[PDB]
């Protein structure tokens, strides 16, 4: 025609999309009619209204037709938009969610400036099955209402996994009924590093945990948005809060044994003891995790950054090594993780751990979360041994890292280091390691960014660290590698900003690097 609709601004870019911008589209000026009997209409209602489009549940002659096609699998979908109807095909609920998110990101102005959808056809499915973000609730804790805002944005960009880092040295947030001190004692630290002066303590206690009903509410809310919540309980390291709560779980026979919920960032030395009592405790904890996260295919057990010195100094640990023919403390760690894997497997789930779990021997059935990009042989060795991996490289996907220029100099915006990890860097990530045999590519489950919160006290700063980098990651995680194009991505990114502004998201502006919400308050108060 003479009027051409704008092309969709969907991120991630769909694998196959045919838009006839000149043809007559579907008018949204009077809202969308949804079939009142289909449960998917309630999700369409939510997503359309999130984007300023009115909806009505109707008895007959709805505007949207939902169809079932098992060949689209867990997450694939088709879209067909004509002036007469919007047809959405999926093999599961989550494919319909993704179709709906693509639809609202295809809304364009008609001749008269009213919202419309162009004549278009989409067939789409993700490259990777694991498309994740990790929330660190230990260093700072975010309330449920803020996690829910995160999960809404994760669904918009087709993330399907929330890795919930729930226990560490500076706080334990996971409610365990049988061991209430884990949260009443382990959920509280006496102070935190001063903002802008990290080598000094602020003298202000910081405490909290999620109640069991809050855990279950987050899991359900996520599930309704296509997202599986995977819990992490850290062991054998990053354990100071649990050991402070129950000092018998640590290496009590070492010189100068003084556990506490830690008040400082970095690596700490308090590790779980490798005793029968500790394994009984861990089995009880794993049992309650399975009750809180009954649909999670995995339990993440950490496994990262566990210093061996306390085990070296502990006669108890040395005797366990001799009992079990273990030559060194790396083999002791492998033994520890093997015993916990049995607990997880006996409850029908799979173990995942940080790539340090290959120390002393990588279990043939574990899944490895690869983060140490300075050691590229670890992922290669894990793949060659047949193990599944999830790529969370600190070269590309550690979103505690700084970004490009433009941030405020104020101490509130300080970060762990001065590495600049830009959204452009993220967009250039290719998750499959070079040289991976074609037949082993299916072992690369996907990728995920980790948002460590030492320097991220609350949601406005979290948003600054995560958006727009998470949009680049969403495309890496979903879109075929050969369709990535940074120039086109930037055009689609710019057209996302009005939606993000309407929610007041404090993203890092692509144009000048400044916060989108420069007056947002960044504070530890809750």
Curated annotation (Swiss-Prot):
Quick one: effect of changing residue 305 to A?
Answer: Specific activity is decreased by 86% with a 10-fold reduction in kcat/Km value compared to that of wild-type
Record's Gene Ontology CC terms?
membrane
What segment(s) does the record annotate as region Disordered? 504-526
Q: How is this protein named in the record?
A: Beta-hexosaminidase Amuc_0868
Entry keyword set: Carbohydrate metabolism, Glycosidase, Hydrolase, Polysaccharide degradation, Signal
- Which of this chain's residues are annotated to bind substrate? 139, 304, 371, 398-400, 452-454
Q: Which organism is this entry from?
A: Akkermansia muciniphila (strain ATCC BAA-835 / DSM 22959 / JCM 33894 / BCRC 81048 / CCUG 64013 / CIP 107961 / Muc)
Q: Summarize what the entry records about the temperature dependence of activity.
A: Highest activity at 45 degrees Celsius. Has about 40% of activity at 55 degrees Celsius.
UniProt xrefs under PANTHER family: BETA-HEXOSAMINIDASE (PTHR22600), BETA-N-ACETYLHEXOSAMINIDASE (PTHR22600:SF57)
Task: State whether keyword Ligase applies.
Answer: no
Q: How does activity depend on pH?
A: Optimum pH is approximately 7. Stable activity from pH 4.5 to 8.5. Retains more than 30% of activity at pH 9.0.
Enumerate the Gene Ontology biological process terms: glycosaminoglycan metabolic process; polysaccharide catabolic process
Q: What is its EC number?
A: 3.2.1.52
Catalytic residues of the enzyme: 168 (charge relay system), 238 (charge relay system), 305 (charge relay system)
What is this protein's function per UniProt?
Answer: Potentially capable of cleaving the specific glycoside linkages in the process of mucin degradation in human intestinal tract. Hydrolyzes chromogenic substrates pNP-beta-GlcNAc with high activity and pNP-beta-GalNAc to a lesser extent, but not pNP-beta-glucose or pNP-beta-galactose.
GO terms for MF: beta-N-acetylhexosaminidase activity
| CDD domains (UniProt xref) | GH20_chitobiase-like (cd06563)
Description of how activity is regulated: Inhibited strongly by Cu(2+), Zn(2+), Cd(2+) and Ni(2+) ions. No effect on activity with Na(+), Li(+), K(+), Ca(2+), Mg(2+) or Mn(2+) ions.
Q: Which transformation does this protein catalyse, written as a reaction? A: Hydrolysis of terminal non-reducing N-acetyl-D-hexosamine residues in N-acetyl-beta-D-hexosaminides
